Amino acid sequence: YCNKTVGELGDVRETMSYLFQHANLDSCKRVLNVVCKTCGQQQTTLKGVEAVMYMGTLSYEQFKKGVQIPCTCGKQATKYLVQQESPFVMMSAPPAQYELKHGTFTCASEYTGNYQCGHYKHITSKETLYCIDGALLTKSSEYKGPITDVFYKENSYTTTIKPVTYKLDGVVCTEIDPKLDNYYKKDNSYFTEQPIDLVPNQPYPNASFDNFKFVCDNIKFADDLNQLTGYKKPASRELKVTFFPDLNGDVVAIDYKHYTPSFKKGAKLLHKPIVWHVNNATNKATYKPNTWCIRCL
């Protein structure tokens, strides 16, 4: 059936492929999922012919976790397999080394030789790892060497590993288990950076500091805030500032240690605007966030 002659060299892959062609395993099912960074994700379903074999050194758990493949768009894509209704799955690849122990796999075969001459050995487990080389027998509990032939046993398996797709203010990206909860979500869209969960703030576009007055018991802090605004009489509106944890005032003073990436655009505690202070005073590292927060006001 292989259409070869006596003494002719052969490949285990093609022999097993022909055997499975003449075998009867049509009821087997295998479903795989492919995830790309930007373009999109796809689902792949395979029948018994494709389910039995795959080209790679991946084990069962390695295939479950995911594989790396190049996408047609030039980016790198992630592929993983969680589906099985079949007795076994076979894995093979170009030569490489592997380490295995008793109970971690079904059986494996070893090949060591040149392109025109090679030797084949198989490993099987009954009580421990057993290796047979023709009339020779080897028994051990652990083994490590250049092995590329994988056979695994499974009845049926299915879990809930799923990809996630999200949009970043103008761009749709797909990732596996992404940290999207750190962003802020509007309806069904996320914002640029990742702050702590807080109400966003919006600065004035190309506008001035609106020429409003700051009032506080800490007169030095209020004067520093006014200097941040470039205050000139008369005042358009007046607001009062109170220090944490006193939230009764119009504005709340917050220590710079609570800075978050979104605070470069604006900062908020509750619905009221907030200001930054160090040692009950302003400094440049707080002057810039205070400038942006006043631009929000």
Binding site: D250, K268, C296
Partner: peptide
């Protein structure tokens, strides 16, 4: 409102179920 932080909170409220 007089508080811009309240304006931002109202915007955050409006963001959910917007479309």
């Amino acid at each position: 409102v007089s508080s811009p932080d309240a304006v931002t909170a109202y915007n955050g409220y409006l963001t959910s179920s917007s479309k």
